[PDB]
């Protein structure tokens, strides 16, 4: 169809950098005891 | 420049992070088409 | 975009110069 | 598609190969000699269409 | 409802297999001998010509000038002064080199 | 065995009659050349007007004819331009010319009738690389 | 006690301060910073600029060529030709920005300024007890930068000639180059492949046998590049342990023995060339150019046998009539 | 724009004295030590 | 030449690295190496180093903190750790070079970086825009037109004056 | 060397060009003269010529509003000379004395200068990069600006070279640094 | 009294002659006699454009241009024959003299707008019946306007007109049945109106200075964008002769 | 210009992918030693 060229940039993005964050704070966390 | 003490460790848990990962990856279902119109 | 998606990875190489010049983690002597 | 002239001969066109991303339209009909040619300077056009 | 390239459509007339006395850079009067040096200079330095004969008048010609003339008249021709052939005083240096 | 003397057989004038030149005199043309015209006409090709060329055609296309010795011993005697009239020593270095550019003071006879048959004999060699600068080579 | 100035003067001479301001960087630093900001700028939003005379701009830049590769500064027009061009000239900035005015206020600087690198790069080599030739390793850089921004331009007309500042701007200054100057045929230009085309294998060597010779510290635990605690007196890396190998692997005599006269001849190899380079260009913005051999071998009736090089003409002839098209009116370029 | 180069040489002015005034006195001296 | 005009290989992203390594590994080749020939120490008489220490005697000429800290205040930031300026060494060169010999292989296919689409359409409409990208393109041709025929004897290239491109006046 | 190589690749006067070779500028020049000459003879204007780029074929407008030589010589509209001086005017070049005036000699005077111009080839070639193998003059004022320069420029390295380290003998630093007492072991190492 | 020198690189050798102040007898007339001009010379002061506004019936505006081009913008040393006609009124001609200078201007906006400042072929007639050019007489007639470039001129891409490549080559297979506009580049040619008032004369030499007024078209850039107005106007001058 | 729509996601990605990766294996890092 006719969507907005960056709607996917948009949700793609949307969908890293919040759930990156979190993918960020809970590794250093399991590292609180030298692990991975 | 000494150290600092308000410098306390910075707190997240193996499930809080899924709790956050459901309601943010869904989050996105709904509110994406929304995006591409 | 382009434009702009170009100055920004710049705008950027100057900021991770600024982290590396002066947030650098000295050097030990042991 | 054959070209040909006031004449008649059948002039051949040759082709561009591989390398070349653009090539320049020449007009040879058989035993190759040159019979017509787009031109690039147009001013001492001999062969010109 | 078309536009073309004044030059080259020029190409499918006389200019384009002989001399056109009003227009061709003036450097295809070497083509022919007891040409170039001056004739040349001349056949240019006067306005187009209504036709191809209107040559020999030229006010100045020496018989023998007129002469040359007359033999290669037979090569000479003329069409339509063309604006974007001839203005850039391209007549003369028409802008092209070995 | 390559440069055969038949082609160092050349057209000394008009009648058509014709002079035969010597593996030796031959490269006295081209020294001699070089020393006078390189500046122009190199590769066989005036660069101070591009409009007019060494060649065979055009010289004998000429006023007068410039296809034999004796006519480019002509001009490098008095030069002219093409078609008749308009003396060009004042311009043009030639034995006229007023030791002017004394590059010809020095040269004979044995000299400008070499030099000349260089100009008949060199299309000969080179296809036509012999008028067309830049665009062969 | 002393007077304000006398501390001003040690506090530019400071070995304390976190990057040394030396006095040349009194005038590096409000150079490179005059320049740099300028240039970030105009490279993003660069007014159409025309280089050549004839009133064409060719502007390449981001809020018009919106590419990297593409946009860059352009030089300064034919028209103000090695004439200063001062931004306070042009009757308006926007006059000032048609005649690439933007270009030299940066190249000066830029230019002048890693002349000031080049010497405040010594500043240390003496504020601080240690061989004073480092800066001189720089001069094989600064130079042949200045070799390409300046003498090339001095040697011609104007700077319009003078390396366009972006990626693709290079290209077109490189070939033009190499159709004006047989600067491929250039026992010059091979000096800067020779060595350059040296500290490439040779950087890959000392880095190679080095790497190639270190005690034993950690055992895969972690990794082997830790066998060094800065600061140490000893020399994590085997010298001797090293050159056994080298030594063996072309003939002896062959591998370096003495360490300090292999780290020299690592300065040796590049600056060397890269400095004949720097002339080469410099050389050829007088008109000395590479080798030519156009036709050179012949035949026996007189036939042109066909040098490789003469191909190399063609390639050359090609670019040599299209460059600068409709922008010379006559047979002959001479710049 | 007159208005501005002044303005420009003045700076100019303004430092190259700062690094000949400056690089004068107490310098031959600017190091660790003199053996 | 050759590559510069049928495949403009300069455009190339792997070759823009090939030349990232060849240069940078010839820079560290000299960064260090008089890096070196003015740290090091006097731990020898004469005005020469050669004699100086070795061969893997006393430990270390170069004092790899008194030049460290000539960096970190020059060029802002130093080396630690010669074991890794050992292998950044090794890396920088034999990477880069590795890089260009993929898009070399690019070449093969004639799969070259050549044109930027965005911009020949953009030039196609418009006789008032032109960049270097196209200056440079317009070389190709020339470096071509002139070569290929005499270059590539086998495909009996025949060229008339006219079809030939070329500049005006030249 | 440098304020040297210079004066050899541009000075007219105490490098005479009837000594050495045309200043490049001076052949640049020589060319339009040329090419000027020989085209209004063939009854052209150029007072009005109008160029390919529609500039000026043979003539066009200074920065300064003068009269100067078209084409790419643009890029040397400064230079002067006793050749064509006379055939110059008072806003630059004069469209009259450039018409008439134009005395003979100045013709080939102004084509020598062309033929003959300050680029060559190494192995002594003369003509541009790409002429065939005939000619073979190198200029003068070619070889004094090329050679000059290599020379005053080591020299600037060669100053940087002795400057440096003559700095570091009135210092002590020449011959490396004092295994015990590195003046940067005591410093507050800035981190 | 100056030379070439005095004013090199001085910015003015672009400006006509300024016809010493006060002297406004003006230069008698034969007829028994033809007279000619030394030369004409026309100094501009601005440069205006035409704007196109997008909106119908509201009157098309003259907004004024700044000069990008480095003063290059004067017309001098012309002339072509001052004649008289079976009236009162002479008509001078033209023949040699610089009269094209291709310069540039930028628009209000972000725009840049080209043209070629010429007289070309200019025909001067002055008011229906003079015996001496007294102030305020004047000429008002035409000439041509040729093409920003020659028909040589090669656009980005190898395309143009006399000799360039034949129609956009980067793209191949991709439909020209619209890129006809910059495939084929003609060379046009229009004719404008300049108009001169004069305000000074030396009825001795025959010097006659004054202001002028011309509107020619911009940039026809060959087969691209139609052009624009420009009306241009500045100081003139020319000296008569017999 | 006529770029590729998508050129963006590409681009953008390519930079946060690879290098978020860093910025985790590093974060985690600090936390050897109970800290952010
Ligand atoms: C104003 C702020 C600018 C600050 C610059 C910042 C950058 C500084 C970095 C290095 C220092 C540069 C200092 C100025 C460089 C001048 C370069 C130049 O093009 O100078 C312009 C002049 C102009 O000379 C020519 O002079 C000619 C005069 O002759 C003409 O006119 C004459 C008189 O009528 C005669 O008629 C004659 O026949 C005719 O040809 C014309 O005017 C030309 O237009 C003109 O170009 O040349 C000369 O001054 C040459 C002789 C003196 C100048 C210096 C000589 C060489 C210097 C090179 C050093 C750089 C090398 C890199 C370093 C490597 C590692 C460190
Ligand atoms: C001021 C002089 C100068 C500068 C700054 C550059 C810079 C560059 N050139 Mg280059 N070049 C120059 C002169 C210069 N060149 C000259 C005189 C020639 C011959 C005429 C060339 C021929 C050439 C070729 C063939 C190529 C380059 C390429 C490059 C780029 C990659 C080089 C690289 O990998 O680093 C080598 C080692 C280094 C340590 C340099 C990297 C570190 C920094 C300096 C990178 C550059 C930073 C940038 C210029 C500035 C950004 C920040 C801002 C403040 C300027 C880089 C942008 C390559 C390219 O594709 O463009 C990117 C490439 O293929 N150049
Ligand atoms: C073998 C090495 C070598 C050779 C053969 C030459 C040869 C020459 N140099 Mg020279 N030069 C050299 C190395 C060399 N140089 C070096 C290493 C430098 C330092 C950069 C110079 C700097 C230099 C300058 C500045 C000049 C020359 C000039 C000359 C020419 C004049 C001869 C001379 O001046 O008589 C001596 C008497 C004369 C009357 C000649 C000119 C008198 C003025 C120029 C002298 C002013 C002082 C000057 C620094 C002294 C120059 C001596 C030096 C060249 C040996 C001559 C061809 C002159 C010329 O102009 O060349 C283009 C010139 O002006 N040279
Ligand atoms: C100016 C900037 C610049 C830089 C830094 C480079 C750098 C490079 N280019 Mg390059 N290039 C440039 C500009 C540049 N180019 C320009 C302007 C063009 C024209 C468009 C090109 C066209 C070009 C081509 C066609 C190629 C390169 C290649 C290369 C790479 C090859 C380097 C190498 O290791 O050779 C060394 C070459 C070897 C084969 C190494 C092995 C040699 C053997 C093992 C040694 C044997 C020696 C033997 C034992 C002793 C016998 C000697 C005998 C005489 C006695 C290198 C990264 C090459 C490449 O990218 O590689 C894939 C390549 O094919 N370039
Ligand atoms: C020390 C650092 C430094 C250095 C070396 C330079 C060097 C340069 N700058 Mg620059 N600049 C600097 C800092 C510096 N700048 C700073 C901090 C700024 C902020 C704006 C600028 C802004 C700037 C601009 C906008 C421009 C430059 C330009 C230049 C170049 C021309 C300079 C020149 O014209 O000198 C001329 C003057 C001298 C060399 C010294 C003369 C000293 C004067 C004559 C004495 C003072 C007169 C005073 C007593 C009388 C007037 C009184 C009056 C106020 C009433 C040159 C490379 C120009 C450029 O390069 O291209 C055009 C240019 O346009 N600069
Ligand atoms: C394998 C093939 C090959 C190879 C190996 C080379 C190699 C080289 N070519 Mg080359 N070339 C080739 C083919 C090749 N070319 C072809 C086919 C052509 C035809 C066009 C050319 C045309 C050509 C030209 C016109 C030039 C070269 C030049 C060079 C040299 C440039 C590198 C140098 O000397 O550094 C020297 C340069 C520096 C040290 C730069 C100075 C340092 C400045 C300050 C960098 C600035 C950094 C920046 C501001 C960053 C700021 C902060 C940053 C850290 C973030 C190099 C030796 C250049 C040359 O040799 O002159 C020097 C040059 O001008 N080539
Ligand atoms: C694969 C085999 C091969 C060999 C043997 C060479 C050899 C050479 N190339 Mg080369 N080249 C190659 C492949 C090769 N190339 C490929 C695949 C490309 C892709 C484009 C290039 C692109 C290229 C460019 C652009 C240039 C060269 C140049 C050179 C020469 C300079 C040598 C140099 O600077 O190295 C430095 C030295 C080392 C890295 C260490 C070994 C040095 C060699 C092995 C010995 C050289 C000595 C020589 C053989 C004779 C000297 C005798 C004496 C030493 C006793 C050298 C003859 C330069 C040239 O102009 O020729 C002189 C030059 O500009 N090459
Ligand atoms: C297309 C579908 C997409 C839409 C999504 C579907 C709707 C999802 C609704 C459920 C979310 C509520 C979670 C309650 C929070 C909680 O309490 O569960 C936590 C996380 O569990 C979770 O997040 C797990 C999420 C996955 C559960 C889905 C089950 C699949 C169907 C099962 C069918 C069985 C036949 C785990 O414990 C929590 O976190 C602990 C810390 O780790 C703390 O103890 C807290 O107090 C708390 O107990
Ligand atoms: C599927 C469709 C159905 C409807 C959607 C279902 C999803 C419902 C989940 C929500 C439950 C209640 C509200 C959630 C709060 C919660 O959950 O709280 C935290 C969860 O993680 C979290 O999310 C913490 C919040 C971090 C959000 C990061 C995404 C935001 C983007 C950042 C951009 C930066 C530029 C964890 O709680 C904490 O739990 C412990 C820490 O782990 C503490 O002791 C406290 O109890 C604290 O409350
Ligand atoms: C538009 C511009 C964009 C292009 C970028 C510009 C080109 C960048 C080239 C420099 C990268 C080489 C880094 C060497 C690796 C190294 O050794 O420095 C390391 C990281 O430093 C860095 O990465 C810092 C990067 C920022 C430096 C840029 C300086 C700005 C200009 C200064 C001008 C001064 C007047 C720090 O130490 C290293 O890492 C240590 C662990 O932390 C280990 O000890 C290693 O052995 C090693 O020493
Ligand atoms: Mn760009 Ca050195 Mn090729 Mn004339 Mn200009
Ligand atoms: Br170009
Ligand atoms: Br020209
Ligand atoms: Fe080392």
Chains 1, 12 share one sequence.
């Not at chain 7, 635990?221 to 030594?247: L, R, W």
């Not at chain 9, 731990?43 to 220490?53: I, K, M, N, Q």
Request: proline residues 5%; contains cysteine.
């Amino acid at each position: 169809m006719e969507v907005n060229q960056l709607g996917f940039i948009a949700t793609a993005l949307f969908v890293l950098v919040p759930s990156v964050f979190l993918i960020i704070l809970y590794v250093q966390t399991e590292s609180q005891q030298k692990s991975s | 420049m000494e150290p600092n003490p308000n410098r306390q460790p910075v707190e997240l848990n193996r499930t809080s992070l899924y709790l956050g990962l459901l309601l943010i990856l869904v989050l996105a279902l709904l509110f994406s088409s929304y995006f591409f119109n | 975009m382009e434009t702009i998606t170009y100055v920004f990875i710049f705008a950027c190489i100057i900021a991770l110069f600024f982290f590396a010049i002066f947030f650098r983690e000295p050097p030990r002597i042991t | 598609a054959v070209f040909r002239n006031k004449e008649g001969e059948e002039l051949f066109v040759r082709r561009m190969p591989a390398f070349f991303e653009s090539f320049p339209v020449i007009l040879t009909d058989k035993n190759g000699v040159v019979k017509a040619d787009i031109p690039f300077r147009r001013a001492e056009s001999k062969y010109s269409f | 409802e078309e536009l073309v390239n004044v030059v080259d459509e020029k190409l499918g007339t006389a200019y384009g297999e002989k001399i056109d006395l009003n227009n061709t850079n003036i450097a295809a009067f070497i083509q022919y001998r007891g040409l170039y040096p001056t004739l040349a200079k001349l056949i240019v330095k006067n306005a187009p010509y209504e036709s191809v004969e209107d040559v020999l008048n030229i006010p100045g010609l020496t018989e023998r000038q007129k002469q040359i003339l007359r033999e290669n008249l037979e090569h000479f021709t003329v069409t339509e002064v063309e604006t974007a052939l001839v203005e850039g005083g391209d007549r003369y240096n028409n802008g092209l080199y070995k | 065995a390559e440069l055969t003397p038949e082609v160092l057989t050349v057209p000394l004038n008009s009648e058509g009659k014709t002079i035969t030149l010597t593996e030796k005199q031959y490269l006295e043309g081209k020294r001699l050349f070089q020393y006078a015209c390189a500046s122009c006409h190199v590769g066989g090709i005036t660069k101070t007007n591009p409009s007019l060329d060494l060649r065979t055609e055009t010289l004998a296309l000429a006023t007068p004819p410039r296809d034999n010795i004796e006519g480019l011993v002509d001009y490098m005697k008095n030069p002219t331009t093409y078609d008749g009239e308009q003396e060009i020593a004042e311009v043009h270095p030639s034995l006229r010319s007023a030791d002017i550019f004394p590059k010809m003071r020095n040269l004979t006879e044995k000299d400008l009738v070499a030099i000349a048959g260089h100009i008949l004999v060199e299309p000969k060699i080179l296809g036509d690389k012999w008028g067309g600068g830049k665009v062969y080579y | 006690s002393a007077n304000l100035w006398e501390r001003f003067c040690n506090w530019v001479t400071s070995t304390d301060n976190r990057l040394y301001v030396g006095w040349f960087g009194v005038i590096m630093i409000p150079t490179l910073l005059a320049a740099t900001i300028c240039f970030v700028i105009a490279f993003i939003a660069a007014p159409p600029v025309d280089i050549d005379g004839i009133r064409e701009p060719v502007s390449g830049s981001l809020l018009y060529g919106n590419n990297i590769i593409t946009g860059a500064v352009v030089p300064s027009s034919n028209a103000i030709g090695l004439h200063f061009y001062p931004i306070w000239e042009a009757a308006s900035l926007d006059e000032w920005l048609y005649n690439g005015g933007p270009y030299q206020l940066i190249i000066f600087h830029f230019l002048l300024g890693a002349s000031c690198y080049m010497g405040r790069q010594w500043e240390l080599s003496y504020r601080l007890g240690m061989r004073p030739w480092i800066c001189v390793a720089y001069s094989a850089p600064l130079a042949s930068a200045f070799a390409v921004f300046l003498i090339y331009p001095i040697g011609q007309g104007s700077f319009s000639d003078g390396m366009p500042l972006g990626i693709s701007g290079t290209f077109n200054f490189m070939i033009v180059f190499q159709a004006e100057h047989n600067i491929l045929m250039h026992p010059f230009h091979q000096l800067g492949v020779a060595g350059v085309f040296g500290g490439a294998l040779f950087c890959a060597m000392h880095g190679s046998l080095v790497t190639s010779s270190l005690i034993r510290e950690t055992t895969e635990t972690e990794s082997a590049n830790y066998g060094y605690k800065f600061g140490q007196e000893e020399e994590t890396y085997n010298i001797v342990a090293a050159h056994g190998y080298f030594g063996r692997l072309i003939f002896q005599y062959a591998s370096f023995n003495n360490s300090r006269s292999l780290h020299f001849f690592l300065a040796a190899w590049r600056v060397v060339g890269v400095w004949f380079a720097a002339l080469g260009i410099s050389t050829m913005a007088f008109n000395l150019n590479g080798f030519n051999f156009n036709h050179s071998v012949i035949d026996a009736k007189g036939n042109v046998i066909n040098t490789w090089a003469d191909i190399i003409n063609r390639a050359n002839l090609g670019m040599e009539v299209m460059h600068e098209r409709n922008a010379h009116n006559f047979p002959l370029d001479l710049a | 724009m007159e208005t501005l180069k002044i303005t420009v040489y003045i700076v100019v002015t303004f430092f190259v004295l700062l690094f000949v005034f400056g690089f004068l006195s107490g310098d031959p001296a600017r190091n660790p030590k003199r053996k | 030449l050759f590559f510069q005009g049928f495949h403009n290989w300069t455009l190339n992203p792997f070759h823009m690295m090939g030349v990232a390594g060849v240069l940078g590994g010839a820079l560290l080749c000299a960064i260090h190496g008089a890096t070196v020939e003015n740290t090091l120490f006097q731990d020898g008489e004469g005005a020469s180093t050669f004699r100086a220490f070795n061969p893997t005697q006393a430990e270390e000429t170069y004092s790899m903190v008194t030049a460290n800290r000539f960096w970190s205040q020059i060029f802002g930031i130093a080396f630690s750790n010669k074991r890794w300026l050992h292998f950044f060494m090794l890396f920088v060169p034999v990477t880069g070079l590795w890089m260009s010999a993929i898009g070399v292989v690019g070449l093969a296919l004639n799969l070259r970086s050549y044109d930027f689409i965005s911009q020949e359409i953009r030039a196609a409409e418009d006789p008032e825009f032109e960049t270097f990208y196209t200056k440079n393109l317009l070389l190709n041709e020339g470096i071509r037109a002139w070569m290929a025929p005499q270059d590539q004897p086998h495909e009996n290239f025949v060229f008339p004056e006219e079809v030939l491109p070329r500049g005006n006046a030249l | 060397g440098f304020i040297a190589t210079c004066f050899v690749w541009f000075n007219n006067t105490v490098y005479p060009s009837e000594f050495y070779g045309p200043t490049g500028p001076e052949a640049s020049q020589a060319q339009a003269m040329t090419f000027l000459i020989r085209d209004q003879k063939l009854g052209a204007n150029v007072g009005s010529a109008q160029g390919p780029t529609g500039l000026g074929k043979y003539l066009m407008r200074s920065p300064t509003g003068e009269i100067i030589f078209g084409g790419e010589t643009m890029r040397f509209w400064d230079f002067r000379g006793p050749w064509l001086e006379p055939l110059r005017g008072p806003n630059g070049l004069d469209l009259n004395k450039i018409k008439n005036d134009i005395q003979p000699w100045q013709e080939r005077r102004a084509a020598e200068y062309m033929t003959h111009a300050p680029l060559g080839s190494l192995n002594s070639v003369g003509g541009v990069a790409t002429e065939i193998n005939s000619v073979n003059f190198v200029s003068p004022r070619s070889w004094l600006a090329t050679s000059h320069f290599v020379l005053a420029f080591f020299f600037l390295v060669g100053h940087l070279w002795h400057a440096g380290r003559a700095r570091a003998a009135a210092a002590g630093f020449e011959k490396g640094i004092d295994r015990e007492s590195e003046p940067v072991l005591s410093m507050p190492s800035l981190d | 009294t100056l030379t070439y020198d005095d004013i090199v690189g001085t910015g003015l050798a672009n400006k006509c002659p300024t016809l010493d102040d006060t002297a406004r007898g003006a230069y008698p007339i034969d007829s028994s006699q033809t007279y000619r001009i030394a030369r004409l010379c026309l100094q501009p002061t601005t440069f205006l454009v035409k704007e196109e506004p997008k909106n119908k019936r509201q009157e098309a505006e003259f907004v004024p241009t700044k000069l990008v081009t480095r003063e290059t913008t004067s017309l001098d040393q012309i002339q072509g024959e001052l004649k008289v006609n079976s009236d009162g009124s002479l008509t001078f001609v033209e023949e040699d003299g610089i009269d094209f200078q291709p310069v540039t201007v930028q628009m209000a906006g972000g725009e840049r707008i080209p043209l070629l400042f010429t007289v070309k072929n200019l025909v001067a007639s002055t008011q229906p019946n003079v015996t001496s050019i007294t102030t305020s007489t004047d000429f008002k007639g035409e000439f041509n306007v040729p093409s920003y470039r020659t028909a040589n001129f090669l656009d980005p891409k190898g395309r143009g007109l006399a000799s360039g490549y034949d129609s956009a080559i980067a793209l191949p297979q991709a439909k020209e049945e619209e890129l006809a506009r910059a495939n084929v580049k003609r060379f046009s040619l229009t004719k404008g109106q300049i108009s001169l008032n004069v305000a000074k004369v030396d009825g001795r030499t025959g010097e006659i200075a004054g202001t002028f007024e011309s509107e020619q078209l911009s940039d026809d850039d060959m087969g691209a964008h139609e052009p624009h107005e420009v009306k241009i106007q500045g100081v003139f001058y020319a000296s008569i002769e017999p």
